[PDB]
Design an enzyme around this catalytic site. Sequence first.
Site, PDB file in Angstrom:
ATOM      1  N   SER A 202       0.763  -1.242   0.000  1.00 13.82           N
ATOM      2  CA  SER A 202       0.000   0.000   0.000  1.00 13.82           C
ATOM      3  C   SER A 202       0.799   1.301   0.000  1.00 13.82           C
ATOM      4  CB  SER A 202      -0.992   0.017   1.164  1.00 13.82           C
ATOM      5  OG  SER A 202      -1.914  -1.028   1.054  1.00 13.82           O
TER       6      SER A 202
ATOM      7  N   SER B 193      -6.442   2.762   3.020  1.00 14.59           N
ATOM      8  CA  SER B 193      -5.816   1.859   2.053  1.00 14.59           C
ATOM      9  C   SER B 193      -6.865   1.089   1.253  1.00 14.59           C
ATOM     10  CB  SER B 193      -4.895   0.854   2.758  1.00 14.59           C
ATOM     11  OG  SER B 193      -3.665   1.442   3.145  1.00 14.59           O
TER      12      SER B 193
ATOM     13  N   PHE C 225       1.347  -3.219   3.947  1.00 15.06           N
ATOM     14  CA  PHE C 225       1.287  -4.606   4.408  1.00 15.06           C
ATOM     15  C   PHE C 225       0.983  -5.551   3.240  1.00 15.06           C
ATOM     16  CE2 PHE C 225      -1.487  -7.912   6.735  1.00 15.06           C
ATOM     17  CZ  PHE C 225      -0.396  -8.718   7.045  1.00 15.06           C
TER      18      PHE C 225
END
Lengths: 244, 245
Positions: free
Chosen positions: B48, B96, B189
């Site tokens: 992200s 995100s 992540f």
Amino acid sequence: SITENTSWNKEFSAEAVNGVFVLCKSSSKSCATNDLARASKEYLPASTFKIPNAIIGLETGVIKNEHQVFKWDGKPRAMKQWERDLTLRGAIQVSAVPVFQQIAREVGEVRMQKYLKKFSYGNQNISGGIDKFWLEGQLRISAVNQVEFLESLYLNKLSASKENQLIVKEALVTEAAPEYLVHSKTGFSGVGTESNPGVAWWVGWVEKETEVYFFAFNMDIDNESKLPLRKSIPTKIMESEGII
Amino acid sequence: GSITENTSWNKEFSAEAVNGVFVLCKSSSKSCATNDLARASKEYLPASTFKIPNAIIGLETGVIKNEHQVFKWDGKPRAMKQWERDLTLRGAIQVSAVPVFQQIAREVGEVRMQKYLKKFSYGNQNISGGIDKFWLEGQLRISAVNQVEFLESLYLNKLSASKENQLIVKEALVTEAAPEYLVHSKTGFSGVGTESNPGVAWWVGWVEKETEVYFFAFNMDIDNESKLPLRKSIPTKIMESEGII
Ligand SMILES: [Ca+2]
Ligand SMILES: [Ca+2]
Ligand SMILES: [Ca+2]
């Protein structure tokens, strides 16, 4: 269009404060307030003037750009927090008066007058000294006019480059959270004189979810100890509205 | 420019049994410090954190209208309930919202996307593996050092894009504001990874304190989502002991 809301004077009376709060959702076309009369009453802007002054400084080239550093000359300043080099956001956040007084002097009266007209900024009266009209001069602006001004800024509609409006907008962020962002500026004219209280301000806007809220609050003040109220009362009101 | 190793920072890493790296650069001296020079140069999936260049590219190509564009939710369920709503550019970056950016990536296209990552000198510049997932599971890789160089360019409005568009993305990245400092950042992540192949977690950004600016980039191997919060707590602890935030 301004609509009075009675469920707001509770926060004022509870603190024995004479003031007004203006809150508008989506736009300045439809606003709510606790006092219709005071919402449009004009007061000395004090440091809230740093917003238009920053824009004008950037527009005229007086402030070269967002990375401009305002060097301290080592000469004593009214507040210790001002005695140091400062960025634009820094000068705005700590309300460094001398920095903005110098910006004003370099902008000059002709250009200053010209921009306050383009910005429809209050009574547009800059007389009394180019470096102090917003502190002790005749310049006056209302909470409603403040909201209209901030909305134009948010929408990049002021007569200035979008670039410069974006620069000032970031310099005004005072609270950031996952769900919302708060852009604001406080102001304090002083304690005033007998029978003539000073004024304290807190204006700005909240970008929450996909909605936007413009606010402006001012109050009579004759004791610096009451200063915290310029933020607590408005914050309480916006919290009960689920805005912040 | 320069970089120096400071293994003392590994302290915060051991205490949490985490293998990772932190890169912190001071803009005035143009000097950086890191707990591990090797990992600092190792390239990982940006995940992200790619939403930063992606957002810039979207505005530049016109795919993204302006700072005020609202990304409407189509109603069709999404991987996270947090993404099931109308979002602003800032909103989409903060939560995100992958789908939102996959759509953007698709409209941008391989040719242009490749062009900008080249102009931006973004990591390995490899976008193969699906125009809408090369940064999530594709071959795109970037190091912690490359991230801070990229972020500095963004800060200085020196990326091959309009200043207006860089400014727009910069405010969208604001995550913490104080009278004395303003923090710009983005988390990342990839996943929990596989055996002997843990995922990667990121936290990159910069801090504008006083007249100084601190660019940072942090990443760590991650096998369990429970350790996710570490991507912020470790760097935060370090910058706190440095009296930055
Ligand atoms: Ca904003
Ligand atoms: Ca004040
Ligand atoms: Ca900034």
